[PDB]
């Protein structure tokens, strides 16, 4: 039972518009380096725009990072029967309902990972560049 | 059919542990009200953790909210071949790399939707409460 399906979406099928974008992508070189390194960890959200084409609802920075890497596809969830109003609500939902993990929590986590012997070079790098 | 798959996962199939949790869930009242009204919009992330059981990697607040709705299940991505280190990385990924949308952006969106005649009462109320103190 599905209205949502996840696919490896060719970027040529994504409409070249940005109605649901909330903010400029900005510099995505750091996000792109992380995606080249680890893969794209979280799929973006799109809806059909007829014509075997799709409109981006969430994920502008991730898509911008994949274009920086000169990739031709993005992992995407396709939402069926997503109205204009419900796509607007979706585009805002992480912004409104996510609780950020503050730097105090990240520092305490780093210290605990160290006490546990779980601080790999790559995780140390990540946490310290975020805590800089 | 690759290395991740999405399921409606019974909550009783999560291990009773919190190895990858970063912070207390806190009051999930408002998140639960939103999920009751709109559905769970984004799936949580898990990995297999024994026979027919799973370990939560991302999504402790959504799981708490669903348990604060007395629901039987959570929408979940099951990650295969997710090592201990790669799960730690994934549990930190949104925290480190997600750029917040600040309230200045939310107010400017509220104002633009109004100016456009596109501001429904529902979205007005959502933006105004996010912009509440
Ligand atoms: N290797 C990585 C590193 C990060 N992420 C994800 O990239 C997202 C970046 O979040 P955000 O700053 O909100 O960017 P987008 O959602 O892509 O862009 P927008 O919010 O503007 O639509 C985070 O969810 C993070 O988990 C990812 O998919 N793969
Ligand atoms: N109706 C709603 C409203 C919110 N969300 C999601 O709930 C998540 C809340 O994020 P966060 O504060 O980080 O909580 P969790 O990820 O669930 O918990 P944790 O970060 O501690 O693992 C956001 O991604 C938001 O999009 C959702 O799925 N359905
Ligand atoms: Mg985002
Ligand atoms: Mg989270």
Full residue range of the structural domain in which residue B88 is found? 1-133
The structure tokens listed for B56 are: 């939560």
Closest CA to B102 of A132, A44, A68, A22: A22
Cβ neighbours around B127 below 10 Å, total = 22
Atom 26 (ligand 1): residue with closest C-alpha? B94
3-state secondary structure of B58: strand
- To the nearest whole angstrom, how far is the Cα of B106 from the nearest Cα of chain A? 8
A108 interfacial to chain B (CB closer than 8 Å): no
- Closest C-alpha to B66, from B74, B58, B56: B74
* Long-range Cβ contact pairs of A109-113 (< 8 A, separation 24 or more): A109/B22, A109/B92, A113/B88
CA angle B5, B11, B16 (to 5 degrees): 110
Residue positions counted in chain B? 133
Is B31 within 8 Å of A97 when comparing Cβ atoms? yes
Give the separation between CA A113 and CA A124, rounded to whole angstroms. 9
Rounded-to-integer distance, Cα A9 and Cα A57, Å: 14
Buried b (16+ CB within 10 A) or exposed e, B62-76: bbbbbebeebeebbb
Return the H-helix or E-strand segment holding B4.
strand B4-10
Dihedral angle sign, alpha carbons of residues B5, B7, B11, B12: negative
Residues A110 and B80: their CA atoms lie apart, in Å, by 26
- B38: β partners: none
DSSP string of A81-124? T--HHHHHHHHHHHHHHPPP--HHHHHHHHHHHHHHT---HHHH
Residue A37 near chain B (CB below 8 Å): no
Q: Give the integer Cα–Cα distance in Å for B44 and A25.
A: 25
Residue to mutate among A97, A106, A117, A127, with most B CBs inside 10 A, is A97
Mutate to test the pocket of ligand 2, among B59, B64, B67, B129 (most ligand atoms within 8 A of CB): B59
What is B71-113 written as a DSSP string? -SEEEEEEETT--HHHHHHHHTHHHHHPPP--HHHHHHHHHHH
Query: In which element (H, E) is residue B36 found?
Result: helix B29-38
Which two three-digit tokens encode residue A48? 């059909």
3-state secondary structure A14-56: ECCCCCCCCCCCCCCHHHHHHHHHHCCCCCEEEEECCCCCEEE
Give, in order, the Cα–Cα distances in Å from B89 to each of A38, B59, B78, B112: 9, 14, 16, 37
Q: In a 3-state reduction of DSSP, which class is residue A59? A: coil
What angle, rounded to 10 degrees, do the helices at A84-97 and B121-130 form? 10
Rounded alpha-carbon distances, angstroms, from residue A13 to A60, A76, A97, B31: 15, 11, 30, 34
CA B35/CA B123 separation, integer angstroms: 15
For residue B22, how many other CB atoms are within 10 A of its CB?
15
Quote the CA–CA distance of B11 and B2 in Å, as a whole number. Answer: 24
Cα A38 to Cα A32, A61, B4, B69: the distances in Å are 10, 16, 15, 35
Question: How many domains, in total, are found in chain B?
Answer: 1
User: How far apart are the C-alpha atoms of B111 and B123, rounded to whole Å?
Assistant: 11
Spell out the residues 6+ positions from residue B67 whose beta carbon is closer than 8 angstroms to its own.
B11
Say if ligand 1 is within 6 A of residue A110 CB.
no
Determine how many CB atoms are found less than 10 A away from the CB of residue A37: 9
Pairing of strands B73-79, B44-48: parallel
First to last CA, chain B: 46
Beta bridge partners of A117: none
């Amino acid at each position: 039972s599905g209205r949502v399906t996840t696919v490896l979406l060719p970027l040529e099928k994504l409409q070249d518009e940005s109605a649901f974008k909330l903010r400029p992508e900005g510099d995505v070189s750091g996000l792109a380096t992380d995606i080249a390194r680890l893969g794209q960890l979280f799929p973006v959200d799109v809806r059909p725009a007829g014509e075997d084409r799709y409109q981006l609802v969430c994920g502008f920075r991730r898509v911008a990072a994949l274009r920086f890497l000169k990739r031709d596809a993005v992992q995407a969830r396709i939402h069926l029967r997503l109205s204009d109003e419900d796509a607007l609500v979706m585009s805002l939902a992480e912004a409104i309902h996510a609780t950020p993990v503050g730097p105090e929590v990240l520092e305490a986590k780093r210290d605990e990972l160290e006490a546990q012997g779980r601080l790999s070079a790559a995780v140390r790098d990540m946490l310290e560049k975020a805590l800089a």
